[PDB]
């Protein structure tokens with residue numbers, strides 16, 4: 001049989017130190033192609049190893065298609081091929097979109113759903129998985145209004161470091177209990193609470209909305225250092241601001257309480273992804 | 285041009301399947317792994333990421349893919365295609381003269397020393413032990429040399445950084461070729477030199493398989509696999525342990541070899557691969573140097 005492997009790379013939709021992401025075409029159909037820098041080869045290996053261990057299939061996890069290694073003259077080319085989400089990242093989407101109650105809740109419940117699926121061990125099944133770099137740039141918006149979680153290059157399985165702005169206090173003060181898998185789930189919950197805050201700001205109530213800002217925009221520089229973050233989160237124990245206007249709106253009042261229970265200094269006090277889902281299903 | 289046509293299946297077995305395919309006008313080999321041998325696919329992929337692994341006596345890499353839709357996954361490895369097949373196949377049907385025999389065994393030694401010796405530099409290669417060397421995992425090239433294939437069980441070591449990577453693979457080496465310390469399970473699993481010494485044992489067995497097919501004084505032996513005379517067909521782990529460890533058996537040297545200087549030197553070389561004490565065995569570099577001089 002003919003094994004058609006040609007992919008037409010059509011447009012670059014992302015360039016960073018990680019490498020590049022392209023909109024590509026396979027057999028008439030959009031795919032996303034991440035081309036890894038040599039600097040970030042271990043992210044390709046880790047995601048490939050995870051998918052070789054468990055073929056995750058979930059509506060709120062970016063859909064895996066292929067891992068490709070090609071020999072070149074004097075280098076190795078590493079590609080990850082996934083589903084393509086033309087609306088782009090949640091970070092992108094929140095810059096110039098505002099939300100209503102239904103669309104805000106749908107976004108955050110879909111993220112909680114994907115995260116709880118990563119976190120749960122299923123016997124028969126899947127290992128428990130922690131993401132370790134959850135943030136709004138690693139979430140994609142689907143046309144049906146739900147999101148999906150992307151980038152398992154730092155993920156850990158039970159049975160590069162995270163983005164500093166989203167690091168939990170125990171990561172910044174190096175007290176994280178690295179031999180306890182639940183430690184990594186609790187780091188993801190902290191980061192989820194920050195994402196919840198980013199999204200909730202863009203939800204309109206009584207004709208008011210906040211501008212898009214990243215977590216801690218008001219207390220750290222762009223590209224904050226590890227020390228900048230440690231002083232804010234660990235030493236001074238700051239948390240993102242909850243605007244007064246949220247307390248006039250029942251949805252944002254509930255969401256403020258939820259994000260507070262993701263930001264406890266004590267990791268074991270934080271909500272689980274399953275508890276977050278249940279709470280979000282009881283809002284509105 | 286990434287497209288590939290699968291033309292014919294050249295083998296199906298516990299390794300999965302290998303196809304002769306066509307890519308950019310050229311034959312390629314396409315291996316589709318068994319779905320329960322996924323750790324071998326990943327390990328070979330880790331090994332072939334290393335540009336400095338490339339060598340005339342190592343099977344040439346083209347691509348590796350893991351593909352999936354829904355709950356199905358396929359694991360592909362694409363390499364050079366050697367139409368003469370494996371050394372096992374070749375020895376079935378061909379006898380050797382002195383020049384051909386030495387070219388084959390020196391090429392295998394050259395590949396094995398290349399694996400075992402670390403290369404230092406920005407583009408480097410760690411020290412690598414194969415762990416499943418056998419005549420079906422050596423391919424015959426039209427120039428009369430061979431190349432070593434199937435790195436799914438390989439172990440890597442860097443002296444430069446003191447790092448040992450043994451992997452997590454449940455698959456064990458081919459039972460007929462297992463060294464005594466593998467069969468008695470006393471091998472020192474945290475010791476990189478132990479894995480090189482397992483390769484040396486298996487190399488000695490391959491030397492014996494080849495040397496049987498080299499004519500001297502109008503005499504040659506029929507192809508036989510190691511230990512053909514002393515174990516059942518399809519030998520078990522315990523069958524092998526019995527003969528190698530309990531009975532202390534090694535392959536017999538046909539007395540006709542001692543009339544030929546080449547075969548006398550090769551018999552001496554294969555005995556120095558077969559010491560029960562792994563640390564007494566020759567190194568791959570020493571075997572290569574010896575074969576260069578014979």
Ligand SMILES: COc1cc(-c2cncc(-c3ccc(C4CCN(C)CC4)cc3)c2C)cc(OC)c1OC
Pocket residue numbers: 002003004005026065066067068081349350351358360
């Ligand atoms: C190697 O590389 C790539 C391959 C492909 C690709 C293209 N056509 C067909 C296939 C295919 C899928 C599955 C089977 C099954 C059929 C049933 N049988 C019992 C088991 C095997 C066969 C063939 C693939 C996997 C796409 C790629 O990119 C989109 C590849 O590159 C990453």
Ligand SMILES: COc1cc(-c2cncc(-c3ccc(C4CCN(C)CC4)cc3)c2C)cc(OC)c1OC
Pocket residue numbers: 013014021032033034080081082083084085086087088089092137138139140150151152
């Ligand atoms: C986060 O991480 C990964 C993401 C993706 C990915 C998947 N679908 C779609 C995209 C995308 C498409 C389009 C735009 C733009 C272009 C047009 N418009 C003006 C604004 C929107 C942005 C983004 C991406 C980047 C794939 C990945 O791997 C293959 C990723 O890594 C795991």
Ligand SMILES: COc1cc(-c2cncc(-c3ccc(C4CCN(C)CC4)cc3)c2C)cc(OC)c1OC
Pocket residue numbers: 026065066351352353356
């Ligand atoms: C990698 O990704 C894509 C792959 C393909 C694709 C192409 N040829 C063949 C297949 C295939 C056929 C049949 C089986 C069998 C397995 C045995 N079982 C008992 C019955 C079913 C599996 C696989 C697929 C899945 C299409 C895709 O999109 C349409 C892919 O997505 C981009």
Ligand SMILES: COc1cc(-c2cncc(-c3ccc(C4CCN(C)CC4)cc3)c2C)cc(OC)c1OC
Pocket residue numbers: 294295302313314315343361362363364365366367368369370373420421422423433434435
């Ligand atoms: C060991 O390992 C790998 C080997 C190969 C590979 C490469 N060239 C040629 C072959 C071959 C062709 C044909 C025969 C014939 C001999 C006579 N008769 C008709 C029966 C069989 C045997 C062998 C193979 C098997 C590819 C691999 O991966 C793509 C291997 O895995 C690394």
